[PDB]
Design a protein around this ligand. Sequence first.
Ligand SMILES: *[C@@H]1O[C@H](CO)[C@@H](O[C@@H]2O[C@H](CO)[C@@H](O[C@@H]3O[C@H](CO[C@H]4O[C@H](CO[C@@H]5O[C@H](CO)[C@@H](O)[C@H](O)[C@@H]5O)[C@@H](O)[C@H](O[C@H]5O[C@H](CO)[C@@H](O)[C@H](O)[C@@H]5O)[C@@H]4O)[C@@H](O)[C@H](O[C@H]4O[C@H](CO)[C@@H](O)[C@H](O)[C@@H]4O)[C@@H]3O)[C@H](O)[C@H]2NC(C)=O)[C@H](O)[C@H]1NC(C)=O
Ligand SMILES: *[C@@H]1O[C@H](CO)[C@@H](O[C@@H]2O[C@H](CO)[C@@H](O[C@@H]3O[C@H](CO[C@H]4O[C@H](CO[C@H]5O[C@H](CO)[C@@H](O)[C@H](O)[C@@H]5O)[C@@H](O)[C@H](O[C@H]5O[C@H](CO)[C@@H](O)[C@H](O)[C@@H]5O)[C@@H]4O)[C@@H](O)[C@H](O[C@H]4O[C@H](CO)[C@@H](O)[C@H](O)[C@@H]4O)[C@@H]3O)[C@H](O)[C@H]2NC(C)=O)[C@H](O)[C@H]1NC(C)=O
Lengths: 319, 320
Amino acid sequence: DFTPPTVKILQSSCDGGGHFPPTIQLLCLVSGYTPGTIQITWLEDGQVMDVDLSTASTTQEGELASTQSELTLSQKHWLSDRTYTCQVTYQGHTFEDSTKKCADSNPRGVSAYLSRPSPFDLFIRKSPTITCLVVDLAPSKGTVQLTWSRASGKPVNHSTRKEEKQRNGTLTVTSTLPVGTRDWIEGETYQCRVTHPHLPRALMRSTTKTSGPRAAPEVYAFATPEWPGSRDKRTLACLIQNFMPEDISVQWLHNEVQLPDARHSTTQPRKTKGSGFFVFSRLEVTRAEWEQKDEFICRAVHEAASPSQTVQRAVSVNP
Amino acid sequence: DFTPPTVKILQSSCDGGGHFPPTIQLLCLVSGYTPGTIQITWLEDGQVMDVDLSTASTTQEGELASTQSELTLSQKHWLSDRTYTCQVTYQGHTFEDSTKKCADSNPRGVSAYLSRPSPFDLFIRKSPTITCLVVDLAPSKGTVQLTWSRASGKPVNHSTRKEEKQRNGTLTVTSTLPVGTRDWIEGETYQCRVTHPHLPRALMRSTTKTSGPRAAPEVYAFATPEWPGSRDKRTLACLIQNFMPEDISVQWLHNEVQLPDARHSTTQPRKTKGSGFFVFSRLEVTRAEWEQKDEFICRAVHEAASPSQTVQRAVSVNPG
Ligand SMILES: *[C@@H]1O[C@H](CO)[C@@H](O[C@@H]2O[C@H](CO)[C@@H](O[C@@H]3O[C@H](CO[C@H]4O[C@H](CO[C@@H]5O[C@H](CO)[C@@H](O)[C@H](O)[C@@H]5O)[C@@H](O)[C@H](O[C@H]5O[C@H](CO)[C@@H](O)[C@H](O)[C@@H]5O)[C@@H]4O)[C@@H](O)[C@H](O[C@H]4O[C@H](CO)[C@@H](O)[C@H](O)[C@@H]4O)[C@@H]3O)[C@H](O)[C@H]2NC(C)=O)[C@H](O)[C@H]1NC(C)=O
Ligand SMILES: *[C@@H]1O[C@H](CO)[C@@H](O[C@@H]2O[C@H](CO)[C@@H](O[C@@H]3O[C@H](CO[C@H]4O[C@H](CO[C@H]5O[C@H](CO)[C@@H](O)[C@H](O)[C@@H]5O)[C@@H](O)[C@H](O[C@H]5O[C@H](CO)[C@@H](O)[C@H](O)[C@@H]5O)[C@@H]4O)[C@@H](O)[C@H](O[C@H]4O[C@H](CO)[C@@H](O)[C@H](O)[C@@H]4O)[C@@H]3O)[C@H](O)[C@H]2NC(C)=O)[C@H](O)[C@H]1NC(C)=O
């Protein structure tokens, strides 16, 4: 029934063109907590700021109370990389949160990408995985460090790096940390921190399960009519659509045996003209295969599908 | 008196280290708006986003109303620099506010791209042009000199130029040049050359008819079945494959109208299995549309298609 105070900071957003506002407001929120003596103080690089600079108010609703504090900063100050801490003292105890201008996302043309677990792995193979790919940089001296960490601080299995210099003259490091199935589904957060000796500071990407509403995919499989010239081959295509989140896995099975991934392609999830995503899968098939057993199954693994997180539709070439 | 609403968008703050949260929450605050119904709407790049990913809250306590709507995004999504908008509707005209990832400290440099005649312009309109686009230009001081030329040395037509200031303060200069069909078709190579005092050495991009083998595209138009979940709209799909080279234009024709590009979602050419390239197109049609004329044709334009660089298939949502 007791609800400790929780601290979080919101900030003025950027221009529709990513431009900073003349002034930056930092709104500190201490939402839904068991009413009690509370105080909110702001720190700029570890020091207490003038009371005249932040306006604080608290209100209650029912069994819990909520309070907020707004601080205005000169754009010049916000851009100087000074750190600002919202310090809350609830019932004599201290709760804190900090922020500073967001660092460059693409330092020196460089890019970083951390991805979530594919649905097949998470549900079918039951061996979840997250891959951290860092690209768009040039070879220097010192090596590149990719460490994995969990928000919960809880340990993390042993990852695996594997860079591979590219043609355009850049390097591409890629590590793949394995995650705890349960761990991931519970909403854990896995961050991928990378310190490049050539690059200024540390670049960091964080990943966790989607939160939005779920919606199972609709699966429709079609077989191309015979096309003049190519009589022993046929193409299968299935549209899997109107599903959420966008994360999905597509597999094809023939003769109760699932075929190898290289046997077909699948587009990237793209939104529908309404709610949800759609994907197209294509399987080039052969006469030997359909005269074998004339049924091919387009299977989709999505977290919203039930009972076993999968939905499928079979198709046959002949009528 | 009657107090006019005001939209403001706050966002998740970064780490104490300047790192982003595993997910970014955007909070839209339309405050002061005098009590009364109101419709908040989010837009991801102009596209209206289904309200299945939002939440309206309101407390017109004391007097004037104040409602807020929050939208959440994954780090990736946010990092893709997609621009988000929050639309309020009150007394007719809608009010709004937009936001995007803040521009990194050091802004990039100029990059030039040279497109190629689209199969459509080349074979349907028979009026092909190649475009030269210079992006991320530092305006104010100086101006970019973009000049065309042919490898044959022959004369080039007059091109038209366009200069557009982007919301991120960068500049875009678009020179688009009419080219001869016979000339393009026969291998003429065109070069675009960019210059500017705030530019080290001159830039140069060239373009010429794609080389290699040719293969005519195959076209298949399908229709998803009618079911209780989609009864006043239907999803059409089309698969165009095994064509070479990659260049191809895809449209959906209906009732003698060439639907807007925006109407459909068409993928970019991927290698089949060496057999050539393939593309997938998906179009959502409405009852009104098929009741006007129950026939939608998927057309692909490709140089290798006989006899008029065109191949097409029609599909119907209803038993004729
Ligand atoms: C400030 O804000 C600026 C925007 O407001 C932003 O500028 C953007 O910069 C980037 C790079 O810096 C630019 O990206 C490049 O865009 C090129 C042009 O794309 C468009 O034209 C293409 C060519 O024209 C077609 O030609 C074919 C035949 O060849 C015809 O069939 C067709 O009809 C056209 O004539 C075209 O292919 C593109 O099509 C896309 O859009 C249509 C829309 O419906 C869609 O249907 C298609 O499926 C497709 O998505 C465009 O119309 C492009 O050629 C470049 O491609 C290179 O780079 C990309 C990287 O994404 C890579 O994938 C490619 O393989 C290739 O190497 C590239 O995408 C962008 O155009 C600029 N936007 C502008 C000027 O409006 C600034 O960057 C920003 N500043 C910052 C960083 O803060
Ligand atoms: C110089 O050359 C290098 C050569 O590598 C080149 O590097 C590429 O750089 C681009 C960016 O410019 C990279 O593209 C980005 O890739 C991001 C991640 O994509 C990869 O991972 C996807 C997920 O699978 C991974 O993770 C799971 C989970 O752990 C794991 O199970 C998997 O094993 C795997 O590790 C994967 O889907 C994706 O594969 C693509 O291609 C296949 C082709 O078969 C296709 O089927 C897939 O659907 C997919 O398209 C890939 O392996 C990605 O998140 C990121 O997203 C942004 O860009 C896209 C553009 O399409 C936007 O749509 C989106 O909104 C985001 O903004 C982006 O796609 C690319 O991956 C690098 N290449 C490498 C090494 O993979 C440099 O660009 C060159 N430099 C110069 C000169 O410019």
